[PDB]
Amino acid sequence: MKELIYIEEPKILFAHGQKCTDARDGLALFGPLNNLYGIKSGVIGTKQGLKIFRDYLDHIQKPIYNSNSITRPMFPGFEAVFDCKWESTGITFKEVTNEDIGKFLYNSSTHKRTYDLVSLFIDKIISANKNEDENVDVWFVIVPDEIYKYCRPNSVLPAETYNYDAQFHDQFKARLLKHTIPTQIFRESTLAWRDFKNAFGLPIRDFSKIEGHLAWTISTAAFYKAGGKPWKLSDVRNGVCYLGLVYKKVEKSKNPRNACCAAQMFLDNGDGTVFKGEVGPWYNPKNGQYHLEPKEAKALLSQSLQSYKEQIGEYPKEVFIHAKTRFNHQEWDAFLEVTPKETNLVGVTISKTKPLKLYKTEGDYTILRGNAYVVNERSAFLWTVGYVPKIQTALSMEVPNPLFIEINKGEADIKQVLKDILSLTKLNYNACIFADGEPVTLRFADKIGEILTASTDIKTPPLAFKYYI
């Protein structure tokens, strides 16, 4: 017989200085942190896409209701929540004719057709940003569904074009990094989900009972990409810098090699949260070696410490390096010789590989979300997915898998590590959910690494997330 400890919910902060565990209820009752005046939208696409986008904007102005209110809270309309204006009147439209899309998607080569389509879509945006006077906050791209199915890694149709990955989204986001334009990509079937059907008279994707969830998610993404702040973490310890490292293989560049990208989070003076990336891949020619050479790791730590010191004035007292791999002595000894003496380096490995499952005896639901099984002083299991009493349901299906936390380097208290990891799961601005399954320091550093490796080398890429997600 073993013992399980339970970890309390972290709580997040909204307007008026109010707290709550659910983002939706906090946004509905108190509203966002900062105050935008309005969002001016630029749309690029066909006439069908423009009509669909205008219809969705008109649709999401009124209150929207879900089938089960307890599980998913209602959507009370955009302006009731966000206290700003985003209507179908600040739209500036740049038409893309259907002939171009038809004729470019004919070469039968994925690389050439993807490059041509991306260039066609981005040249108009570049021109409208350079040679025009109108102001656009977030650009909205509305791609037809018939090009989405063909621009994928493994896709077959039923000149510096080979240096890029054959995916529309990654290349599109990468090639606009040097102009710093926020963008949101939509599929025609995502907004006009009724009109696209199958052999039966039903939509392929049925949003009849989860329409409020889609409205919440789209509104939150559009409000974040316009330079807004919808919530923040209530309790973050001072003097603690959280880092996150992810390795992505740079496919098809003269050899099989792989890079590394990071993310960082801390609390700055003024009770603000600085959640921002750490960019510029650090490589190593070895194939399958998910590690860093000393020269490439000293630079990474120096960069992170310099950033924190520049924003704060003093070095961090504690630095936690979360990762999904295991460090070695060769690279960890590269650490600790650029780190000062008044700073604690803790390297924590997070994985979801070990197959443990817990079942309730004489019941029908799953285990709580706070439960943790402490194996040792350097090892534990934490359930980040499970039954949440507030929404009266679980965050997954079947029986969820635990997250295996293992203190790899340094010394730390495993309970505090679990508390910080659980608190790091409430900052998913790409989503409007109760909580996420893994820390976002490992997810946003993965999105940035996925975008950065689908283009040629670009000097000093932006750090802000709004240009990536």
Partner DNA sequence: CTAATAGATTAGAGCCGTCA
Partner RNA sequence: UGACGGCUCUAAUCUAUUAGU
Q: Which amino acid is at 192?
A: A
Residue 458, annotated as binding a ligand: no
Minimum distance from residue 286 beta carbon to RNA (Å): 7
Q: Is 146 an interacting residue with respect to DNA (CB under 7 A)? A: no
Strand-pair category, 138-143 with 344-351:
unpaired
Beta carbon nearer to RNA, 210 or 338: 210
Q: In 3D, which of 383, 388, 386 has the Cα closest to residue 405?
A: 383
Q: 280, 461 in Cβ contact below 8 A?
A: yes
Question: What is the spatial order of strands in the sheet that 138-143 belongs to?
Answer: 92-95, 41-45, 138-143, 183-187
Q: 243, 321 in Cβ contact below 8 A?
A: yes
85, 92, 396, 462: which one contacts RNA (CB under 7 A)? 396
Q: Is 433 an interacting residue with respect to RNA (CB under 7 A)? A: yes
Q: How many CA atoms lie within 13 A of 279 on its CB side?
A: 22
Q: Is 454 an interacting residue with respect to RNA (CB under 7 A)? A: no
Q: Is 437 an interacting residue with respect to RNA (CB under 7 A)? A: yes
Which range, of 25-33, 106-114, 183-191, 237-245, touches RNA by CB under 7 A? 183-191
Which range, of 95-103, 263-271, 366-374, 399-407, touches RNA by CB under 7 A? 399-407
Residue 52, annotated as binding a ligand: no
Residue 248 contact among DNA, Mg ion, RNA, none, beta carbon within 5 to 8 Å by kind: DNA
Q: 226, 36 in Cβ contact below 8 A?
A: yes
Strand-pair category, 240-250 with 379-382:
unpaired
63, 102, 256, 285: which one contacts RNA (CB under 7 A)? 256
Q: Is 67 an interacting residue with respect to DNA (CB under 7 A)? A: yes
Residue 313, token pair as written in the block: 């004035």
Residue whose tokens read 């309970």: 415
E strand map for 56-179: 92-95, 138-143
Residue whose tokens read 């650029």: 338
Beta carbon nearer to DNA, 269 or 353: 353
Angle at 319 between CA 337 and CA 368, to 5 degrees: 145
Residue 419 Cα distances to 277, 282, 444, angstroms: 22, 30, 20
Residue 2, token pair as written in the block: 């073993």
Largest CA distance in the chain: 71
Residue 238, token pair as written in the block: 């001072």
Residues 6 or more apart whose Cβ sits within 8 Å of residue 366 = 360, 386, 387, 394, 396, 399, 400
Strand-pair category, 240-250 with 257-268:
antiparallel
Q: Is 153 an interacting residue with respect to DNA (CB under 7 A)? A: yes
Q: Is 369 an interacting residue with respect to RNA (CB under 7 A)? A: no
Beta carbon nearer to RNA, 211 or 318: 211
Minimum distance from residue 357 beta carbon to DNA (Å): 18
Which range, of 10-18, 126-134, 167-175, 337-345, touches RNA by CB under 7 A? 167-175
The rounded distance, in Å, linking the Cα atoms of 109 and 155 is 10
Please give the size of the binding site for Mg ion, defined by CB under 5 A: 2
Minimum distance from residue 411 beta carbon to RNA (Å): 26
Minimum distance from residue 249 beta carbon to DNA (Å): 4
430, 441, 453, 455: which one contacts RNA (CB under 7 A)? 430
28, 221, 305, 417: which one contacts RNA (CB under 7 A)? 221
Minimum distance from residue 310 beta carbon to RNA (Å): 30
Minimum distance from residue 432 beta carbon to RNA (Å): 7
Residue 181, annotated as binding a ligand: no
Strand-pair category, 19-20 with 403-409:
unpaired
290, 303, 338, 343: which one contacts DNA (CB under 7 A)? 290
Angle at 178 between CA 174 and CA 182, to 5 degrees: 70
Q: Is 101 an interacting residue with respect to RNA (CB under 7 A)? A: no
Residue 443 contact among Mg ion, DNA, RNA, none, beta carbon within 5 to 8 Å by kind: RNA
Q: How many CA atoms lie within 13 A of 351 on its CB side?
A: 12
Q: 282, 299 in Cβ contact below 8 A?
A: yes
Q: Give the burial string for 219-237 (b: 16+ CB within 10 Å, else e).
A: bbbbbbbbebbbbbbbebe
Residue 306 contact among DNA, RNA, Mg ion, none, beta carbon within 5 to 8 Å by kind: none
Minimum distance from residue 92 beta carbon to RNA (Å): 19
The rounded distance, in Å, linking the Cα atoms of 80 and 220 is 13
170, 318, 406, 420: which one contacts RNA (CB under 7 A)? 170
Beta carbon nearer to DNA, 138 or 424: 424
Q: Which of residues 196-255 bind DNA (CB under 7 A)?
A: 209-210, 246-249, 251
Write out the residues near RNA by the rule CB under 7 A: 148, 167-170, 173, 183-187, 190, 205, 207, 210, 213-214, 216-218, 221, 256, 287-289, 352, 385, 395-401, 428, 430-431, 433, 436-438, 443, 469
Binding site membership: which residues? 430, 468-469
Which residues contact DNA by CB under 7 A? 67-68, 71, 152-155, 209-210, 246-249, 251, 258, 290, 324-326, 349, 351, 353, 393, 397
